[PDB]
Design a protein around this ligand. Structure first.
Ligand SMILES: *[C@@H]1O[C@H](CO)[C@@H](O[C@@H]2O[C@H](CO)[C@@H](O[C@@H]3O[C@H](CO)[C@@H](O)[C@H](O)[C@@H]3O)[C@H](O)[C@H]2NC(C)=O)[C@H](O)[C@H]1NC(C)=O
Length: 267
């Protein structure tokens, strides 16, 4: 990931005055108070690529807040790849929730705790999205893989260009302790910080759902068809030690377990 200024790749979409720009936009702060949160989105749309953000989450009491960094297509039957950071009362742990929507259908939530305090320093949160798989990374650690399992009849984000989005907003009904902990608005403003703003992707308009260099990109090469053994060991550790919720092993919601799971090593 190469660090660039916000304005190279992104535009604000809501509550422009709630985005504070530092060092020429090399760092931004998103602010949330009782009237409004805020968000931004990429200027371009992409079909496959490598997308990365450095983030430092809301310090102190962040209960009820969600800081999101995600890719989404536009139409109905949408595809989406999500990082959703769920805050907490002071000194209680953040959750990093991930999710994948295909053809308008999600319900693929996983929730992890992190192996560092995400409010203390900036860390990298990244998506690698190619025709074979989607990988979610925290720094150099893969925390989830969503493989292209079209051969098993599972849909995959495959031809809908997506924009990159980020936002900070209240989500009282479900964010903290499943919705039991409500935002304490006397602790506003809640501030999330971002750097890097890295986009390396196959630019593709909604107009045309194609990129003229498809298959010729570095992420289309053979080495990116799968994670290597080292990366899978790091992933298994996240699965065994840091995962508090995993749609794959949730037999109450999925008596009929999803086909991707064994392949993704979420089993
Ligand atoms: C915010 O902090 C609270 C603690 O105040 C976190 O809630 C705790 O979540 C853990 C993991 O889900 C729970 O522990 C687990 O309990 C189950 C049994 O239900 C057990 O199977 C596991 O081995 C594990 O011990 C814990 O009960 C729960 N505590 C409370 C008071 O709710 C929460 O995860 C933090 N994050 C967010 C965004 O809520």
């Amino acid at each position: 990931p190469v660090d660039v200024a916000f304005g190279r790749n992104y535009v604000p979409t809501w509550a422009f005055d709630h985005i504070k720009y530092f060092n020429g936009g090399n760092e931004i702060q998103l602010h949330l108070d009782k009237y409004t949160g805020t968000g931004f989105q990429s200027k371009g749309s992409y079909l496959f690529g490598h997308f990365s953000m450095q983030m430092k989450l809301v310090p102190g009491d962040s209960a009820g807040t969600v800081t999101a960094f995600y890719l989404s297509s536009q139409n109905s039957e949408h595809d989406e790849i999500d990082f959703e950071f769920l805050g907490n009362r002071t000194g209680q742990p953040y959750i990093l929730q991930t999710n994948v929507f295909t053809g308008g259908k999600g319900d693929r939530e996983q929730r992890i705790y992190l192996w560092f305090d995400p409010t203390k320093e900036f860390h990298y949160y990244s998506v690698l999205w190619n025709m074979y798989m989607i990988v979610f990374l925290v720094d150099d650690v893969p925390i989830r893989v969503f493989k292209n399992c079209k051969d098993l009849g599972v849909k995959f984000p495959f031809n809908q260009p997506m924009k990159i989005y980020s936002s900070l907003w209240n989500a009282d009904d479900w964010a903290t302790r499943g919705g039991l902990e409500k935002t304490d608005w006397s602790k506003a403003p809640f501030i999330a910080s971002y750097r890097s703003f890295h986009i390396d992707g196959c630019e593709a308009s909604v107009e045309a759902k194609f990129c003229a260099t498809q298959g010729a990109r570095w992420w289309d090469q053979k080495e990116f068809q799968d994670l290597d053994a080292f990366q899978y060991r790091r992933l298994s550790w996240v699965r065994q030690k840091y995962t508090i919720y995993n749609y794959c092993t949730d037999r109450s919601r999925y008596p009929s377990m999803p086909p991707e799971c064994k392949r993704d090593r979420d089993i």
